[PDB]
Amino acid sequence: SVQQQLEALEKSSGGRLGVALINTADNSQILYRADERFAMCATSKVMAAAAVLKQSESDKHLLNQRVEIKKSDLVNYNPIAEKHVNGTMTLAELGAAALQYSDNTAMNKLIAHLGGPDKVTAFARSLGDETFRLDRTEPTLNTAIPGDPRDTTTPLAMAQTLKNLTLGKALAETQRAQLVTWLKGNTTGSASIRAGLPKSWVVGDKTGSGDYGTTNDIAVIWPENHAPLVLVTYFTQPEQKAENRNDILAAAAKIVTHG
Q: Which positions form S-S bridges?
């Protein structure tokens, strides 16, 4: 069975696997440890970006508001923001950079605009997500310590909320569309869920990775002849210095969309 294949995959991998697939044709679900908490790592960046889009629903100048990038703002891994030191980036550009390149400076600028991590949590609560919590900024939100509740969610909660954000009621249409456009242009996910799927399918996703070999991907999937699928694959391991395992996420994607 699908359940037996995921269990064997997890055993042989040496870690803990969390999967939630929602089939929007009939709201059927494939769940594996989907009520267990996992460290989100950079998959939390979707919530911070969405929180800014929500603000833009009532303020038509917000996304084009300029933000100055100073050398001191830079943290670790800054592929887009480092290209703009002593210049500016708009809030829209920072959302794009946070999502499509997983820029960490971009994420911190979004959090600071919103007023801190607790405002990202409050936004999640406003969508009906009672599980998501963001506690820290970059880079420390990726420590992914086993049993640590900070900066965690569950696979099912994140799958439900990702569906609401991209396909459902959470955002007005223009903002929903802008979020989907960003996810579809992600550059970081080619070896994760996407690699387990037919090459013709269209995918929007956001990866995450952290310590304890924590390796994550969340995706919206548009088949060519079927209703969309939403898939969350979270994976973490017991040793702090474990290698990340994007191949495990690809394998899990292949198992749960078979037939």
A: none
Tell me the C-alpha distance between 104 and 76, whole Å: 7
Based on the structure, what is the number of domains in the chain? 1
Give the burial string for 222-234 (b: 16+ CB within 10 Å, else e): eeeeeebbbbbbb
CA distance 86 to 74: 11
Is residue 208 classed as helix, strand or coil in its secondary structure? strand
Buried b (16+ CB within 10 A) or exposed e, 107-117: bbbbbebbeeb
CB 183 within 8 A of CB 204: yes
Q: Count Cβ atoms below 10 Å from residue 92 Cβ, excluding itself.
A: 18
Which amino acid appears at position 241 of this protein? K
Experimental method: neutron
> Which residue range(s) make up the domain with 159?
1-259
